Amino acid sequence: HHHHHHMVDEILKLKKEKGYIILAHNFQIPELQDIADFVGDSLQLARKAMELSEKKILFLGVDFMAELVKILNPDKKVIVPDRSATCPMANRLTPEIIREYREKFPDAPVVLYVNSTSECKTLADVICTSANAVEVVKKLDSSVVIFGPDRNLGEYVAEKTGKKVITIPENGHCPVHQFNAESIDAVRKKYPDAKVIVHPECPKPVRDKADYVGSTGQMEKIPERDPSRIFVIGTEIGMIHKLKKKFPDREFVPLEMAVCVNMKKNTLENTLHALQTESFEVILPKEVIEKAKKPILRMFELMG
Ligand SMILES: O=C(O)c1ccccc1C(=O)O
Numbered sequence: 284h285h286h287h288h289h290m291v292d293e294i295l296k297l298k299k300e301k302g303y304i305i306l307a308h309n310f311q312i313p314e315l316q317d318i319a320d321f322v323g324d325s326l327q328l329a330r331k332a333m334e335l336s337e338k339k340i341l342f343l344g345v346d347f348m349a350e351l352v353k354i355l356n357p358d359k360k361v362i363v364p365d366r367s368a369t370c371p372m373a374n375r376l377t378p379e380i381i382r383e384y385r386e387k388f389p390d391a392p393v394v395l396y397v398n399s400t401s402e403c404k405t406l407a408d409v410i411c412t413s414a415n416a417v418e419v420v421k422k423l424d425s426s427v428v429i430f431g432p433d434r435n436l437g438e439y440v441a442e443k444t445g446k447k448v449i450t451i452p453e454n455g456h457c458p459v460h461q462f463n464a465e466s467i468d469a470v471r472k473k474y475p476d477a478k479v480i481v482h483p484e485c486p487k488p489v490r491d492k493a494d495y496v497g498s499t500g501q502m503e504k505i506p507e508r509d510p511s512r513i514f515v516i517g518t519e520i521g522m523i524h525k526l527k528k529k530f531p532d533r534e535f536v537p538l539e540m541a542v543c544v545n546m547k548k549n550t551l552e553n554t555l556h557a558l559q560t561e562s563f564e565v566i567l568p569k570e571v572i573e574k575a576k577k578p579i580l581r582m583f584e585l586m587g
Pocket residue numbers: 323324325326397398412413482497498499500
């Protein structure tokens with residue numbers, strides 16, 4: 284909107300002037316997606332940052348993602364506008380629980396979802412995303428794996444791979460994606476020709492009623508091969524804007540309104556403040572960077 288056109292102009296000039304690149308997660312408000320150089324998922328953004336000349340990064344998302352970017356770009360300054368933006372699911376897994384479960388099942392590799400603390404990543408055998416988790420677990424020798432922090436994704440991986448997936452912590456889940464299956468019944472009657480796409484973080488009954496299950500990266504490729512005029516989307520509300528932007532010819536309908544409060548902590552105002560003050564810098568110990576990079580590079584190595 285034109286009322287913010289002077290705010291946007293100061294963001295563009297400062298970003299240009301100080302050599303920032305702005306990376307925004309798909310769950311950011313539309314206003315921040317519209318000012319970002321690249322919008323996508325966590326790993327997509329971090330990988331993207333490795334490729335660029337900009338020595339400074341403004342990251343718009345939540346803490347474990349900004350740290351991922353820093354882990355993989357450690358000589359680059361990474362700032363976030365709100366340091367309290369975090370992932371409640373990720374924060375429920377701890378080093379202690381991982382260590383507890385490694386002892387119980389010492390032959391099982393620890394596969395950690397990218398939505399995990401940096402400290403947790405130092406202890407994982409490999410990282411995955413919702414896009415590549417099935418393939419990653421498939422390529423591991425073992426037929427029993429330890430997986431966290433999301434139980435639903437773990438269970439999905441178990442279904443797709445046929446392997447035993449021991450999920451940690453107990454009842455690990457994303458509250459944003461706990462859609463109700465009756466919501467799918469309801470949209471099918473309302474839009475009989477619509478396709479339902481939901482995230483694998485969604486519970487089993489929702490995944491099973493959906494036409495497609497995939498990551499937000501996967502969602503945004505579906506209309507390249509599906510010609511449907513209407514898609515119903517089971518993930519965080521920010522993806523609707525992303526999808527509408529990429530495919531203006533289609534209609535994107537939320538399965539339900541689902542908002543990640545932590546993702547919405549970032550605003551045009553605090554983003555502007557961040558660029559004015561070049562704060563808040565993501566600072567990690569060298570040793571955590573060194574150790575946590577290992578399972579992240581292995582993920583890339585395995586998928587290569
Ligand atoms: O990308 C996704 O689908 C996604 C959904 C929820 C949280 C985190 C991510 C992420 O990997 O960035």
